[PDB]
Design a binder for this molecule. Sequence first.
Ligand SMILES: [Mg+2]
Ligand SMILES: [Zn+2]
Ligand SMILES: [Zn+2]
Lengths: 38, 79, 50, 1337
Amino acid sequence: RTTDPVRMYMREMGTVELLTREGEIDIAKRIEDGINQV
Amino acid sequence: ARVTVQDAVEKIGNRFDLVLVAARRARQMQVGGKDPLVPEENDKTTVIALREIEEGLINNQILDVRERQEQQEQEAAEL
Amino acid sequence: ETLRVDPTNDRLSALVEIYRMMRPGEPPTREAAESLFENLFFSEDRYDLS
Amino acid sequence: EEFDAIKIALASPDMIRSWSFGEVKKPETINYRTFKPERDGLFCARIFGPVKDYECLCGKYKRLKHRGVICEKCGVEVTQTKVRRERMGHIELASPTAHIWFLKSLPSRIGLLLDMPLRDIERVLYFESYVVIEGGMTNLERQQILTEEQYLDALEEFGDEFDAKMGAEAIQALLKSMDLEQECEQLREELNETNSETKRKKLTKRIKLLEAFVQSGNKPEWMILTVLPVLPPDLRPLVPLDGGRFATSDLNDLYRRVINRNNRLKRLLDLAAPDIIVRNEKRMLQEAVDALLDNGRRGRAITGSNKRPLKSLADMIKGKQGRFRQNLLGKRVDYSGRSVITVGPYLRLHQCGLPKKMALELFKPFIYGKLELRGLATTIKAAKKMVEREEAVVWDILDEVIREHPVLLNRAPTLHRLGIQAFEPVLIEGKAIQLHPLVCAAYNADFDGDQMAVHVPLTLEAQLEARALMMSTNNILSPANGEPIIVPSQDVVLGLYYMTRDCVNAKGEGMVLTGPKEAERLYRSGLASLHARVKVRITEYEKDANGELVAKTSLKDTTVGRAILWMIVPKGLPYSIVNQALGKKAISKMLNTCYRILGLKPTVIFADQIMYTGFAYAARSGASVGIDDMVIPEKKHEIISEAEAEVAEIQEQFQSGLVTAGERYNKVIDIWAAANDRVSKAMMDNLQTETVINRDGQEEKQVSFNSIYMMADSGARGSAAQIRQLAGMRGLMAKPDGSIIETPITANFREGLNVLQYFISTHGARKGLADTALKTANSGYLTRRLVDVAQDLVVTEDDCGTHEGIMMTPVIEGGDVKEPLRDRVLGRVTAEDVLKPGTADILVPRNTLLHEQWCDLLEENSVDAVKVRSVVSCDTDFGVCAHCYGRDLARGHIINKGEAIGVIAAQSIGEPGTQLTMSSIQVKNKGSIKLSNVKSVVNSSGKLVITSRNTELKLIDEFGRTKESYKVPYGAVLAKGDGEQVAGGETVANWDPHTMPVITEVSGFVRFTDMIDGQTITRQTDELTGLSSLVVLDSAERTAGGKDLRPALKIVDAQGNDVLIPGTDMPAQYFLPGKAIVQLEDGVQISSGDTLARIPQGLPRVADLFEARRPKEPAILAEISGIVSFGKETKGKRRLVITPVDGSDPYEEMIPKWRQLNVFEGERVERGDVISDGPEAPHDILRLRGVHAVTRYIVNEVQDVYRLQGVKINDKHIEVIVRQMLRKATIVNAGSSDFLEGEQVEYSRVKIANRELEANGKVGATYSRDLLGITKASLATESFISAASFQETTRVLTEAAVAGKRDELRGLKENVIVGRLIPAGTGYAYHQDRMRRRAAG
Ligand SMILES: [Mg+2]
Ligand SMILES: [Zn+2]
Ligand SMILES: [Zn+2]
């Protein structure tokens, strides 16, 4: 019966992880490309 | 009289009404400035008010009659 | 009596549920409960008798 | 200003828009240096108000050239100020968060309504799970949760045709959806389908909430917050100090907190975030909201660097701390003072010592008006100057004021109305207040470091109320009892005792007088003894005639002191009262006679002189007390050595191994206590009457010369116990364990302790002192609750015209009289015409003032019971008649209307309780015997044995009014009968105090039937003799083959019949339980009255008594008359096949038959008949019995708890609260309103006094009658403010607001805190004038 939203939010963000080194720059590419097409 | 409140009550019957009538009569005389009917004997207004009550001279009814009559004569004097 | 009443077949599950009751939620990993227990009563840092 | 009534309601959002003056927009408040209210911050004058008169901030607009000209630059007003305590700003919210009091508290009020679990809603509103707003398709359902991942399933399946979200948006919508009426008629309907209990109450509950929102017009969505108020600064201020140092309130933080979060809400909401962060943010927001309403409710509280929580809004209302108990009902006061205190021995009643500066500064504007009047000080600056100049005139002027100007005396703790008083001033050249010492007895006060405070009656009304009401001449007795409270305390008593005293010894014996004047001359010449019986004449007076004195005169041989003393006495009395040594009880009753006979003022002035002369002739009397006045007998060492060589006897006995410790323990303490008693007796005989002084004879002995006994005999101080401690052993001692020590004390303080003796003396001393340090808390607590109950109650009427009430009978029981019915009656008033043992000699026409002539007139009569119009039998709506009360005691006449009452019993009862926590029957003398409600029998002895447990014994006198009364067990053995006479001192009864007889009134054969060894029973034949019978085991030990089979050895004849109960066809055989073991076998026969078998063996109390506290262990009773058999076989509890004569059998209830039964498996009871054994509960009594029985039980109980301690209060007081516990009765039938619901029995009686009148033969309903615990009885109130003041406040307030309720200020508490006058007493007349105005429009 943990009401502390510390536990909630840290759980809810521990959900996700990180990726690196080209998915990063792939996202950059995607961003800038859609931007160039706007 | 001063220290004891006995026959003033035996006249009326209830302490509450006695201090009501007293504190009316002696505001007519504290601030207004009308006349006594019992002698003075060098006491504050309280004792003499209680004295006027004892011998059957001041009452709620009697104050009512006196102020009624006087105010009615003043209403007549207006016109 | 208590043993039968005790459902942790293994030490490992015991670690899990210790961690769980103490840290209610579901993040489990091992070193968490391991170091936890070890720091309770077996580290100089957080415990001393006089 | 004047307003009629109050009201609560639900503030709409636009209601707040209406209330507010501007919206707030930033967390800032001021500059660092220009300590200035900032715009749009906290203290923005533009919205809340200005500091100074007509000064915009930049000074643009000024001095009324520009009057109503808001300075456009700073946007600041010009006009007048003093609204930084009035104006509330506001804030508009982004999104809705919820209120909490309508959420978190018990029954939830919000989801309570929705028929939904809380935790579900938490999962919604901690933003964890979605949930059906509305199933667009009924594929799914409203009030149905979807996890945010299963929601995906529901979603990608359909996407479109469902409504399901997570937040107040999801929920206000729901409220905004749901229609009330249909739901209401539906629950009304399908209740009648299935109106089982929990179901029915739940349906009723929801229908109530429904129709409440209907008819209120209050609304469900208003739970939730979209605009929020903001308070004026001056309730939440910030100030500096002389050091330049600043100081704030908690709340300015919390307001500030939210701002930034809402800013970071909206700031983010410009910026298109993932929902997760939004959820987090909203959590922060509504968390802050909770923190405002309650820091520490939902969870771990919130602090600054204090490390301590921040004070809630709620905390301002709370505990004592809020307005109620700190700042509103108790108050600081101007024109009051205090000082250390002392005595005026010389003084009279109305007088009081007064250090003069006190009155000086306290009577200043009198003097300033007076100096302007004289014009010495023409105006007031010079008046104060001249004050500093210390002119004699001032003091004359000061005296000239002070005459006849009464004043108020104040000590704390104030436990009853007499603990403060009203005197007349007297001035003195000291700084210690002198007073009339006796009234310490009233104040429980003493000149050992006490001090007191003082107040002024400025206004004439107060002046005269003082002079008339708590003038002491108007207050001499208790209202608790007819007790003179000005008992001459300690010294006057003793000097007088010494005076009225009859030696033979001194001189001047056998001469004669004219009168006490020459007695003075004669003794004072030095001829005589003031204590010596010698002849004189007296001339005493009596008002035998029409209140008219009747003179006479004759002689007496009396002591000289008494002759002298007659001179004081006012001429209406005999000599007989003054004819003795006058213990202080004699003084009590003596002054009693004085006002009994003459009245007040003689007794008053008499008493003053008695005080005076006591001082005089006691200071003459000569007195001291010393080492040799303390005296030891010689017959102590030998009793000591004797019992010392006997404790050693039993010591060596235990050494041999004979006796136990507990045997040894009890007997050793017995012999030591006996030795103590013998020592006490020796010293008493050796000090009381030891002195041998000759006087015209060989030797003569009289009142002692030890100096110690008559200290106790006077009643001044002390008693035999303390004196024993000084002289003999001072009883035994205990460690705080509660155990008892073995070796008692030998030395005394004349001889000197051991190390160990004092070491041990330590303990219980510390213990009982700790107890003395804490019983006051419970005392104040309880008495506070008592007043908390009965505030409503005042007399209203002369006569309620009501029908009879209580009966009075004396309480003598078990001994001699304990309450004379004389003493019960006096000042009450009859219920009824009342005749004499001379029959039909009525003397009341249903009601007279039962003064002591009537009581004497009775006490003549052998009458022993009478009825009285009861406060309960009074029927005045919202008050009482004075008749059902009768007399005010310390008045000493009939109670007049208007004085409130419940407070009176409270002071009566609470005050003393501080002091309060700390076989055979043998006839005594001869007398008539009175036993009834009886079945019994000529036993096999020929004497008498009960066969109906109801009965008990009394010794009635030869007349007919009782002497003694003692319980008598069922079937116990007697040596006597009823309606006989017996000699005194005669064991009439006997029984085995272990046995509960299984006696057979029948005469019939025994045969082993219905019972077989090791099925229902065991067979245990007595190894020693040989005779036995089939031996019944307990519930458990027998075997299960006949454990469901009731064992019963059966009474037969030579044929085999059932010997039926004598007089009724009912068979006679015994379904024998455990321990009902029979001794004689099959074929045997018993007698009438023959055991087949035997059956071998304070403060919190009263706190529970009044609390409506309730046991766990009932001596359970017969619900209904008629026969009974037993029931189901113990699935935790046996049940009980009841069977009325003409009623209906099926009632039967779980019984722990582990505990003993009264009636057996084939035995009949009447209703109102105990079935098990133990204590019992009050609610059982009401639920079954009448009332008189009930109230009578409890009053007897608790009065005994008092009187135990030697405690004295009239019963009337205790009647009173009863009717205040009884303000609610649950309904039986229906047709007027809802079915069963508890409601004002008063208003029940109203509606039936309209409706079941020919309005209807009947539409409405009959009704039960109920009872409530006292605190919750207090809560259950029409008003809420008295309910709101003290306890469980928040909840009451919410429940009050939901229906938009209101109040009318009828209880005094209500009218106090607003500053109005009382609805009673003095303001009775005024407030009834106002009442008829409300009647007259
Ligand atoms: Mg004291
Ligand atoms: Zn300006
Ligand atoms: Zn009545």
